[PDB]
mmCIF file of C-alpha atoms in Angstrom:
data_model
loop_
_atom_site.group_PDB
_atom_site.id
_atom_site.type_symbol
_atom_site.label_atom_id
_atom_site.label_comp_id
_atom_site.label_asym_id
_atom_site.label_seq_id
_atom_site.Cartn_x
_atom_site.Cartn_y
_atom_site.Cartn_z
ATOM 1 C CA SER A 1 -23.108 13.132 17.903
ATOM 2 C CA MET A 2 -26.805 11.700 17.955
ATOM 3 C CA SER A 3 -28.777 13.589 15.151
ATOM 4 C CA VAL A 4 -26.267 15.566 14.630
ATOM 5 C CA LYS A 5 -24.009 15.193 11.863
ATOM 6 C CA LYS A 6 -21.293 17.207 9.191
ATOM 7 C CA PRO A 7 -22.421 16.830 5.765
ATOM 8 C CA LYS A 8 -22.127 13.595 3.551
ATOM 9 C CA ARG A 9 -18.853 13.793 1.753
ATOM 10 C CA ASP A 10 -19.617 11.778 -2.056
ATOM 11 C CA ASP A 11 -17.577 8.147 -1.324
ATOM 12 C CA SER A 12 -19.301 6.517 -4.184
ATOM 13 C CA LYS A 13 -16.589 6.645 -6.464
ATOM 14 C CA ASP A 14 -13.662 5.813 -3.659
ATOM 15 C CA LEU A 15 -13.386 1.983 -4.717
ATOM 16 C CA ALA A 16 -12.813 2.900 -8.331
ATOM 17 C CA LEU A 17 -10.338 5.489 -7.553
ATOM 18 C CA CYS A 18 -8.612 3.419 -5.042
ATOM 19 C CA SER A 19 -8.514 0.242 -7.762
ATOM 20 C CA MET A 20 -6.870 3.138 -10.392
ATOM 21 C CA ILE A 21 -3.854 4.229 -8.236
ATOM 22 C CA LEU A 22 -3.242 0.404 -7.345
ATOM 23 C CA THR A 23 -2.712 -0.010 -11.183
ATOM 24 C CA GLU A 24 -0.485 2.831 -11.396
ATOM 25 C CA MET A 25 1.556 1.079 -8.374
ATOM 26 C CA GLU A 26 1.702 -2.213 -10.223
ATOM 27 C CA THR A 27 2.669 -1.117 -13.489
ATOM 28 C CA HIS A 28 5.515 1.448 -11.929
ATOM 29 C CA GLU A 29 9.054 0.112 -12.442
ATOM 30 C CA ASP A 30 10.140 -0.269 -9.227
ATOM 31 C CA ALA A 31 7.230 -2.108 -8.011
ATOM 32 C CA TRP A 32 8.958 -5.420 -8.606
ATOM 33 C CA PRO A 33 9.979 -6.370 -4.760
ATOM 34 C CA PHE A 34 6.128 -5.642 -3.692
ATOM 35 C CA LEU A 35 3.985 -7.572 -6.259
ATOM 36 C CA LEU A 36 3.615 -10.571 -4.577
ATOM 37 C CA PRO A 37 4.078 -11.899 -0.533
ATOM 38 C CA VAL A 38 7.437 -12.404 0.362
ATOM 39 C CA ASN A 39 8.226 -16.140 0.404
ATOM 40 C CA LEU A 40 8.586 -16.957 4.191
ATOM 41 C CA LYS A 41 10.113 -20.333 3.640
ATOM 42 C CA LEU A 42 12.979 -18.911 1.803
ATOM 43 C CA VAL A 43 13.900 -15.485 3.105
ATOM 44 C CA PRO A 44 15.324 -15.595 6.745
ATOM 45 C CA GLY A 45 14.075 -13.605 9.782
ATOM 46 C CA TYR A 46 10.995 -11.987 7.410
ATOM 47 C CA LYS A 47 8.473 -14.252 9.385
ATOM 48 C CA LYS A 48 9.981 -13.393 13.102
ATOM 49 C CA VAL A 49 10.495 -9.810 12.569
ATOM 50 C CA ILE A 50 7.746 -8.573 9.954
ATOM 51 C CA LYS A 51 5.077 -9.367 12.053
ATOM 52 C CA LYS A 52 2.060 -8.076 9.233
ATOM 53 C CA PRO A 53 3.160 -9.044 5.826
ATOM 54 C CA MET A 54 1.618 -6.778 2.882
ATOM 55 C CA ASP A 55 2.269 -6.594 -0.657
ATOM 56 C CA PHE A 56 0.244 -5.198 -3.838
ATOM 57 C CA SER A 57 -1.308 -8.725 -4.779
ATOM 58 C CA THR A 58 -2.905 -9.027 -1.287
ATOM 59 C CA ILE A 59 -4.156 -5.552 -1.389
ATOM 60 C CA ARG A 60 -5.747 -6.213 -4.345
ATOM 61 C CA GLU A 61 -7.290 -9.402 -3.703
ATOM 62 C CA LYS A 62 -8.637 -7.557 -0.586
ATOM 63 C CA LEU A 63 -9.841 -4.683 -2.453
ATOM 64 C CA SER A 64 -11.805 -6.897 -4.699
ATOM 65 C CA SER A 65 -13.645 -8.710 -2.247
ATOM 66 C CA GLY A 66 -15.043 -6.011 -0.140
ATOM 67 C CA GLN A 67 -12.313 -6.189 2.951
ATOM 68 C CA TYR A 68 -11.656 -2.547 3.243
ATOM 69 C CA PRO A 69 -14.544 -1.048 4.766
ATOM 70 C CA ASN A 70 -13.240 2.545 4.006
ATOM 71 C CA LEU A 71 -10.318 4.577 1.859
ATOM 72 C CA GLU A 72 -8.499 4.888 5.076
ATOM 73 C CA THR A 73 -7.901 0.997 5.692
ATOM 74 C CA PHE A 74 -6.739 0.946 2.205
ATOM 75 C CA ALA A 75 -4.192 3.544 2.401
ATOM 76 C CA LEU A 76 -3.002 2.153 6.008
ATOM 77 C CA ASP A 77 -1.969 -1.569 4.234
ATOM 78 C CA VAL A 78 -0.468 0.555 1.459
ATOM 79 C CA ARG A 79 2.053 2.349 3.751
ATOM 80 C CA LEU A 80 2.341 -0.806 5.846
ATOM 81 C CA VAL A 81 4.138 -2.432 2.614
ATOM 82 C CA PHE A 82 6.567 0.516 2.582
ATOM 83 C CA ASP A 83 7.071 0.431 6.360
ATOM 84 C CA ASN A 84 7.776 -3.090 6.221
ATOM 85 C CA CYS A 85 10.081 -2.891 3.217
ATOM 86 C CA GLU A 86 12.304 0.271 5.327
ATOM 87 C CA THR A 87 12.352 -2.514 8.688
ATOM 88 C CA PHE A 88 13.698 -4.954 6.796
ATOM 89 C CA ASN A 89 16.096 -3.150 3.679
ATOM 90 C CA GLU A 90 19.034 -1.003 3.875
ATOM 91 C CA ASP A 91 18.102 2.554 2.576
ATOM 92 C CA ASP A 92 21.448 2.181 0.441
ATOM 93 C CA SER A 93 20.158 -1.106 -1.583
ATOM 94 C CA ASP A 94 18.253 -1.636 -4.773
ATOM 95 C CA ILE A 95 14.954 -2.472 -2.985
ATOM 96 C CA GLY A 96 15.600 0.376 0.291
ATOM 97 C CA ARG A 97 15.075 2.911 -2.793
ATOM 98 C CA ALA A 98 12.412 1.021 -4.611
ATOM 99 C CA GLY A 99 10.363 1.479 -1.356
ATOM 100 C CA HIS A 100 11.285 5.254 -0.951
ATOM 101 C CA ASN A 101 10.494 5.704 -4.560
ATOM 102 C CA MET A 102 6.797 3.929 -4.604
ATOM 103 C CA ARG A 103 5.912 5.585 -1.101
ATOM 104 C CA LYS A 104 6.839 8.792 -2.743
ATOM 105 C CA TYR A 105 4.550 8.073 -5.819
ATOM 106 C CA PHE A 106 1.890 6.510 -3.832
ATOM 107 C CA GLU A 107 1.294 9.352 -1.512
ATOM 108 C CA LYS A 108 1.381 12.346 -4.741
ATOM 109 C CA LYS A 109 -1.342 10.156 -6.096
ATOM 110 C CA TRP A 110 -3.111 9.828 -3.300
ATOM 111 C CA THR A 111 -3.347 13.830 -2.067
ATOM 112 C CA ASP A 112 -4.006 14.399 -5.840
ATOM 113 C CA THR A 113 -7.033 12.229 -5.924
ATOM 114 C CA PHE A 114 -8.668 12.961 -2.185
ATOM 115 C CA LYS A 115 -7.282 15.982 -0.580
#
């Protein structure tokens, strides 16, 4: 509360570390469904159903331009990518499996880097 603070966690490396994680996600072989924004002109249903589209290139641009206030807002956008994928794609499809794999990969790197 006012004038009463928990000890200061060092957050000075967070930007660099989120960039490294994001690089590792960009270079995974199963990243191809998530590299670029879904083409809303060419994919029926996507625009109406998926209220907040998100992709790795959009996260990279937000990261590079100071649009994440803290590492939790970064993780929320990464998770959004996989939550959107599960909303629109069957589990038993190439894209559906890709999303599960990438979410697993992400959550391990997140834990190992920060928890």
